[PDB]
Amino acid sequence: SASAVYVICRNYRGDVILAHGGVRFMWIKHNNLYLVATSKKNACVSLVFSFLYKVVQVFSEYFKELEEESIRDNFVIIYELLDELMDFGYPQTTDSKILQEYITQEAPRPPATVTNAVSWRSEGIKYRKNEVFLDVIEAVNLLVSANGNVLRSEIVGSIKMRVFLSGMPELRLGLNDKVLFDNTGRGKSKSVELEDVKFHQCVRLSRFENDRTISFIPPDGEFELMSYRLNTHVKPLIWIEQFKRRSTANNVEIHITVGSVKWVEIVWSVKSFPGGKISVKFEIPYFTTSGIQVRYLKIIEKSGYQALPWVRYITQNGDYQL
Amino acid sequence: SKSSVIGWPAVRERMRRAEPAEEVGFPVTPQVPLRPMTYKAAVDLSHFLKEKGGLEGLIHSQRRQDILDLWIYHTQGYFPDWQNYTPGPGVRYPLTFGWCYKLVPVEDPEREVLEWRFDSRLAFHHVARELHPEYFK
């Protein structure tokens, strides 16, 4: 229940996390400015934070940089976006791609996608080819104490796909999930035991809840479909006083024989680290630590076309601090 | 498939060497396609195994089955999950439709001796699906 969102300002209720007496000033710090949104009633703080995050994402999508140079240069479209985003303190639209068809900085009726249930896939999109590029980004976070033991060792998956197809395909994501393997009766091979799986808005919650069916309409462009998060009980890939020798950790940067050492802390920068050779910045591509392998992607379109799905697995170091 | 024919003798020898009863990581071949085995592919593999021999009548073992699945995945990019057998006791039918291989008793289902036997009706009748409709969805 924000009263006025200010960066530029745009009042939403006119009745007006900090607190100026009876008015709460809840805002986050951006790259150069703090988006303080005044509130007076018992508004949802989580809702305000989500609205601020959505606004930041929309600004990043529309403007490649988040600085004061664009605040004073793109006010014509910024004001329109702010007015359209939230009315009376209640946001209604948050899709940057969908919003790009009604508000431009360089106006017809709003697209029916916002009115329709599918607000994350613009209808009528046509391309010469139907290629969707996936990105299974690995995040290795290790919390090793000074005694030598690892306390917090969690790996969070991130399936980011750049869908570029024709029409409104309804992707049916299928992987080697442990729960799915157990339900189908194949709970004996390598299955990913994801403790927490966070699907995107395109993925239907009911389908996943029913029989672990991940069916959703992918959007046009790069977006995060699913975000797995499960604990890891294996030895660390890098031991600082262990990964497979077939994997190479490109751009190894262990922040404190081989590799350039430069003091800016001591940055142990290594270009290529063969397998078997303080925060580490290891990023070994083509290495799936969790062992989760994508099974199938049911690309179904009403028009009917032969899709060419693609995906790559990248293993990087997340909260890998020592 | 010249590669499959070449790998069949070595795979059979390795399975025979392993009795019936060190490196970490999951490397993936760059650009190698990975997908579940299809019914037609499973039928073709079963026919090739029957023609070449070494699989029909061989004593079923976990190590031999794992080695065969790994060899199949290496030579074809098929996930090692379609080579599943129905729960015992008795004859275990293949989990993947189209597979002509099945396990039959040779004498708790775990202690029962099983051997791989060719079954042409498996590729046409979904015995595993009929027995376990819940497992087939």
């Binding site: 199938y296 690309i299 790559r312 | 650009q31 396609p33 990975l34």
Partner: peptide, 18 residues
């Protein structure tokens, strides 16, 4: 080529599960 692992084609569904 591309850093972080070459992109690989994805399947359509579990062909072994019907």
């Amino acid at each position: 080529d591309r850093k972080g692992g070459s992109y690989s084609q994805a399947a359509g569904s579990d062909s072994a599960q019907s």
